[PDB]
Each structure stands twice: as C-alpha cells, then as structure tokens.
Design a protein around this nucleic acid. Sequence first.
RNA 1: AAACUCCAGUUGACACAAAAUAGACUACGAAAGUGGCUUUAACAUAUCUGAACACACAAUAGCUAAGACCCAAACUGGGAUUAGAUACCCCACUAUGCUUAGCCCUAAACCUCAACAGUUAAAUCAACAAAACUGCUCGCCAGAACACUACGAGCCACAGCUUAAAACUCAAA
Lengths: 117, 137, 208, 86, 191
Amino acid sequence: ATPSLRGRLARFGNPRKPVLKPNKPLILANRVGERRREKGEATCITEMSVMMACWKQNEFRDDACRKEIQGFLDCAARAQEARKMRSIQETLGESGSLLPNKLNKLLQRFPNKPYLS
Amino acid sequence: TKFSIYPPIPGEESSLRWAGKKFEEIPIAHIKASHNNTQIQVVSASNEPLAFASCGTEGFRNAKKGTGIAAQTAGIAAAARAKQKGVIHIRVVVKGLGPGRLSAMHGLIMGGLEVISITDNTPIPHXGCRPRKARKL
Amino acid sequence: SRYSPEFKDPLIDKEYYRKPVEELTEEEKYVRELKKTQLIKAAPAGKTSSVFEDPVISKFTNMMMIGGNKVLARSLMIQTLEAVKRKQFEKYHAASAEEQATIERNPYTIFHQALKNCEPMIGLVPILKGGRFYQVPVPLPDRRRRFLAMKWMITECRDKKHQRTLMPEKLSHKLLEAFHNQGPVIKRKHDLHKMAEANRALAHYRWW
Amino acid sequence: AKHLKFIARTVMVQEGNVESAYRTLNRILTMDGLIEDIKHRRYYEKPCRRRQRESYERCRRIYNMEMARKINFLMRKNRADPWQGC
Amino acid sequence: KTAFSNVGRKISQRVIHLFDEKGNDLGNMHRANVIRLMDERDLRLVQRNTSTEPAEYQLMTGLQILQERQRLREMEKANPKTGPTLRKELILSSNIGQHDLDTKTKQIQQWIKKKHLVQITIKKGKNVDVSENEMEEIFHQILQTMPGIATFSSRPQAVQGGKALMCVLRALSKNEEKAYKETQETQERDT
RNA sequence: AAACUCCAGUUGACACAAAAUAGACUACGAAAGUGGCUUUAACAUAUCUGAACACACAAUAGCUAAGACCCAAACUGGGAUUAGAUACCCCACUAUGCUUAGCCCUAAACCUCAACAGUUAAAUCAACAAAACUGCUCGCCAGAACACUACGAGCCACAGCUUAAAACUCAAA
Ligand SMILES: [K+]
Ligand SMILES: [K+]
Ligand SMILES: [K+]
Ligand SMILES: [Mg+2]
Ligand SMILES: [Mg+2]
Ligand SMILES: [Mg+2]
Ligand SMILES: [Mg+2]
Ligand SMILES: [Mg+2]
Ligand SMILES: [Mg+2]
Ligand SMILES: [Mg+2]
Ligand SMILES: [Mg+2]
Ligand SMILES: [Mg+2]
Ligand SMILES: [Mg+2]
Ligand SMILES: [Mg+2]
Ligand SMILES: [Mg+2]
Ligand SMILES: [Mg+2]
Ligand SMILES: [Mg+2]
Ligand SMILES: [Mg+2]
Ligand SMILES: [Mg+2]
C-alpha cells in the first residue's frame, strides 16, 4: 500500500504544517527512467592470484606453474564465451521485466491525465 | 534435520558438534574492519589470546592498509599463528564496514581455518556521542 | 575496399573439399550449398594450397618486412631456418647416442616452440576509475599473446646492441635461446609478469 | 554490552559455504536498515538536513510505488495487437 | 616518512644481508631462506640500513621493535632535527598599488620570521612602459621595511627574456644578525 | 604529513552526554518547539475580531555566576595544498552545546499565503506557485537606492535590540 498523501502538503484547508516538501509535483510522468549501465565483477581473479602465487615461489618459471597457468587460461576462455552469450540473451531477450524502451511504449498508450478534457 | 541459520542457544541440548566441541567452546576470530586498517585477533572461548594480526603488522603502510588484499594478508597471518595452537573451527565476529570486512574472512579460510558462523557487532548507538562534522568536498 | 560487402573470403583447404558427403552434417550441408550462391574474393598472392605452407612463419615474415620488400624479408626468413637447421645438425653430430635423442633438428618445430615460450599470459591494460587510469593486470586474448611474442623477437634482433651481425645469424641465435627458455626475449616476458604481479592489488578494477 | 553474545546478527554457516552465509547476514543488516544507518552516522547529519532527506525519501517511495502500481496494472495490455491492419 | 616497523613477509630484494636478533651478522642469503628463519624462530624483519649496496635487514621481536621505536623518538624530542627550507613565491606587477604592496610586504615579513626563502618576481605592468631600474626599486622598498631581518639570497636578476626581474630573500644568519647589532651599536656610540 | 605510541585488540567494571528501530505513522502545543522509560500535575474561553509599545511567551547564537565534561567544536596552534590560502582537506584543543539561577529578545521565527464565517456557480484564471471567489475585521503597503542607516525615544540590552527619516542620485528598479 502506497503511503497516504492526505494532509501531507502545504495547502489551503490543511491546517497542520506540511509533512512533505516535494521539489517536483507528485504526478506520474509518462515515462520511466533508463536503466543504468552496471559494472560487473572481475572473473577468474581467484585463478589469477593462484597463478601469480606459484610464480613468486618458482622465480616466474612457467614450467613449474603449468597447472595453475592452464586453469587461469581455461577460466579466461570460459569467461570469454559466457561474456559473448550474456549479450545475446540478456540484451535482446529482455528476460524478466521489460526494458525502459518497451515499457515507455506501453505508457504512451495510457498517458497520465492531470487535466480535464 | 533441516538446517537452522540461528545459532544454538547455550543451556539447551543441541546435537551440533565440531571436533567434539560445542558451539560455546569454539574459539572466536574478532575482526575490526576500520576505514583505514583491519585488525584480527583469535581468542579462545575463555578469552585467551591465541593470535593477532593487522594490515600494519604485516608491512602495509598508509593507504595500502585500507585495501582488501591487505586484510586478506592479515587474515592469513592470524590463521597461521592460530593453527599452530590447535585451532580449526572458529566463530567470526566482525565489526565495521571497512574494505577488509569480507577479505579478512577469506584470509582466515585460506590459512586453514573453518568458519562455522558469522556475527556482526558493528557498534550502532541508539541515540550516543555526536560524530564529527560533515566534509566539504 | 573495392570488394562489396557481398564478397566472402576464400577457403583454401584441399581437405575441406574432398571430404565425403556422408560425413557431412545437416549444418555443414547447408553451408556448402550456400557458398554456391555467394561471391568469393580472389585468393591473395600470399597463401596457397601448398603442403609446405605455414601461416605463423608467413605472419612473422610480414612483420619483418620493411617498405613492402617482401623478397628481402622472405630471404631473411629462409636463411634463418637454414641457419637453425645447420646449428642443430652440428650439435647432433657432435653429441653422444644418448644426447642425440633429445636434440631437435626440425627448424619449424623449433620456431613454433620458441615463440610459444615467449608468449605472455597476462598483460597491463589501462582502466579508468574515478577519473584516473590504472595499469590493471588482465588476461590477454590469444591473438594478442601471439602478436607480442613475434613483436618482441623482431624488436630484439633489430636492437643496436648487435654489432654488424646479419639478421639470419641474430634471429637463429635468439630462436634457439628462446627454444631453451633463455635469452632476452624470455626475460621481457618475465618482466611483464613481474610488473603485472606487482599491480595485483588493482586486478579488481576489471569488469569482464 | 549487557546482553548475551552470539545471538544478535549471527548466521550459521552451512556446508562450509561462507559466501552464502555472509550474503545472508548482509541481506539481514540491509533489510533491517542497519547498513544505511551506520553509513549516515559516520558524520553528523544536522537536523534540518535529516528532515530534508526524510522528506525526499518519502516522496520517492510514494512516487515509485504509484508508478509500479500503474505498470503492473497495464502489463496485461502488452499482448499482441488483436486488430492488426485496422 | 620511513617508519621503523616489521617489513612483513614479502621482501623487496632477492639477496638480503641479514643480521641476528642479538646483532650477529648472518651474511647474505635469499629472501626465501629469510622467511623460513622468521617462521622457525618466530621473529619479525626490520630494515636497519638501505644505503648499503646489499640491503641490510635484521630479525627482531615485537618487544625490540618497540624499544627501538621509542629510542628514536626520544632522540628527536631531545635533539630535534631541522626541516628543509620551504620556498614561497610572489609575482608582483610594476604598477602594483601601494595598499596591495603593503599587504604583500607584511606577508613577506611573516615568511622571513619563519625562516623561509621568498622568491619575488616583478613583471611589467599591463599597458605600462617601465624600465628595469624602476622595477628593481620595488625590491629595495620591500627590503627597506626589514632593515636587520632580511637580505638578498639571490640579488635581482633579469629573467623570462628580460621581461621580469627575480630575487630571493632570506633571514639573516645569527652571525650576520650580531654584526648588524654591532654596527648599529657603534653608530649609537658615535651619536 | 603532522599527531599518539602508559598505544592498540579481546574481556570485565563503568555518565550532570545523547535518545537506533517503531515513524511507509502525521499526532501534540499559541508560536518557538515536541518522537528512550515511569509517575504526579496538566493542555483558557458556549459569538467572532481585537496591540512593534500593554500582559505573557519566543529556535540557535550570545552575556553574568556557580557546577558537570563522553563527544562535538568558533577561535587558536600544528600538518598539507597553493602564485598566495588568514580557506576548502588532516590533527589537537578552548569558548560554546549540558545543569542551576538570572539576562539577552533575534531568524529564510517562511507552510514568505492574517483571524473568523461561507461557496464551487457564474467571467475559471496575467505568469509561476499550492484552483477561483464572497462576507467581516484587524495589521500593513504606495518607484529604485540611500536604509536591518542617521537622529530622537525606550530597554537588565553599552560593538546591542525595537521604532525609523532626510539630503545628494537615477529613469528605472
Ligand atoms: K532512543
Ligand atoms: K522577523
Ligand atoms: K520557508
Ligand atoms: Mg522548489
Ligand atoms: Mg527514523
Ligand atoms: Mg481574541
Ligand atoms: Mg499599532
Ligand atoms: Mg518584534
Ligand atoms: Mg530565546
Ligand atoms: Mg547558553
Ligand atoms: Mg574531541
Ligand atoms: Mg569544553
Ligand atoms: Mg541531558
Ligand atoms: Mg521554523
Ligand atoms: Mg489577527
Ligand atoms: Mg522607496
Ligand atoms: Mg537584524
Ligand atoms: Mg539600528
Ligand atoms: Mg541611537
């Protein structure tokens, strides 16, 4: 349930002092905001530290860190293909909630009417 | 039996054990995650100090102490000294929202310790002392 | 480009075409019937269907070419391959029956392995965070790893430290060193690993 | 200080999964408002500044909840056009 | 600042000249061997001297590190070392008003009492034709308010392609100060 | 960087300071203000309006006297930055914020919207803001600037507050 707005704003007829001082009129716009671009987390950083740990103990000789180097390489390739698929699926399919562009088209058809006609 | 995220209450009869020890007997790892440093102290259930380590005691200085990798290094150092005294399972009590809050716990695990519970004890006054004034940036 | 976007790159592989029809899948059958309706670019004068074709050596040759003088670049390449092979035949005849089993005399095997020993696993890429650029260690793609190996080898041979030594003798000496995990090109890889390990704290700035 | 210890803000780890236990704890502290409370207390927020922030946050809740109610009300209308061509 | 604290487990150099907790010289060894010693004896590593070509580190206990760190701060509290001289800069114009020149003259006086070096540059005023002899008079006007307090560290010298002059003022040395008092007293005895 | 290093962490004992969550509630009071707990007393008026000055109040800062002191903190000192930095950033500490007894009487004390009664129809209305009006009463206003000023007067106020002009000036504000 939306919090009440009865007697919250400074108006004629409202005796009490205002509860809310909105710097913008509390009237629904005909659009929603654009989803912000997010910063993902680094992948394989765990395997990267394991690789750089053997280097410190083996004088940076790749011959002694093959299993750790390979793991960090395989992870990077898997994280590369997954990054390649995350775009095809999440950007185009619009899984879950709609995207702002599609949701704004739906609001265009039912605009908020703060005036009389 | 289904898993319970609530800790066992002392005095009640619980079936949970860790190396034959009850929850009230597991040593405690106190983590103080400040904005510029991280301090880790492992104590026994009777409050006997077992190991201490901070980003400062591990050779980090100035802004480098307030990093996750510095707290992880301090966690490994404390776990090494605690593991020599016969510590395996620990109860983690962390206070503060510093950058080494989670990293300090990773270092403890990398050092050979098993965390059975996590407790936050960040001090929150319920009304207390007035904090310093806001910064102009 | 004087080719319209409709032109496809040519596939120069004899085996690809002699493959029986039964072995083909429904997807590979579609690609073959599709190419019969597409425009194909003319095969460049570089690559052919020869059995002695090596795409890695061809690429290393172009990276040595100065001012489009391919004849000279190709000449330096084959002289290096001959110089490497003569050094291995001399090391082979001068070795004992037991040591002879471990001596490689194929210059193509030595060349590929020498470059593989110089490819760096991680590099430093500038990432912007808070209005500042930080050298963040990141994994390198396969293309970048192979390119850096070739560029470091060619740059080392052009260094003025070599006095009056001809390129085929310089390069053949560097390849045999890198083939044994030695020399200045291997050292340059270790420095990039040491400088990426020093900036290990900045690794979390990456987001992929 | 005077209460019993290892009851408040305590989560048990399951099968050594320390990451999931930490996320559960962080989610608990967030939903109860302790995280935002700790951050706002690092520096003193003057009373007039707190009143302005509370008013801004309350107007934002009212607006966001009303926009969400209208989106859920109109979502059924996102189906295919039944009179395509007319 | 260079603090006297445990260096940690990650040592900068590969070859390390190590010493014993009691001062016994253990010679040079690889950092991998030093870390083994720190764990076998349960000691911490400190950096005693870095100027030497072979890096000199010493093993110590937490108590020794405290005693040394306490010793060092008492040496400074008793024999405090002097800090480096700070250089203050001023850029004046040839046609600077008298009220503003007095403001900056009082500022120069406060820098000299703190034993700073004041670099004063005088540029040709805007839409003004001035000679180097007239710009050089401002320096003497400034230094005339400080008779026995300041002197020229670097006398006026044309710079910036002859467009501007530049000098450096300093505080009179103790010997130079006693000389001024002496010369001043002689004039008093004569008068 | 300075600062501290009888410092820091765990545990226990431990306020003349301040009052998480509830509060997405919208209440109380004339306003100023009032959001930890308990109890006592207690929130005028059966017509309305009615004061710079009468009468009684009035945030914060401030004054006088005596106390308390965790934390915060004008000033001041130190560190840093800068062409300079009497600032912004870091550290320390004081008046002050608290209690008691007296003063001082100000605020963008503004929800910049006077009290009481009534209306939603007509012409709905310059613009914006928080739709437009009626009756009645008190207060206040008449180009800008000079001017929260000068002078006079009053005041526990002595660098204060309240009341408050004119000359010179402009054709705008
Ligand atoms: K409270
Ligand atoms: K007023
Ligand atoms: K207001
Ligand atoms: Mg507004
Ligand atoms: Mg609240
Ligand atoms: Mg009345
Ligand atoms: Mg009157
Ligand atoms: Mg008044
Ligand atoms: Mg008052
Ligand atoms: Mg007071
Ligand atoms: Mg303080
Ligand atoms: Mg005080
Ligand atoms: Mg109180
Ligand atoms: Mg008010
Ligand atoms: Mg009235
Ligand atoms: Mg007027
Ligand atoms: Mg006033
Ligand atoms: Mg007055
Ligand atoms: Mg008067």
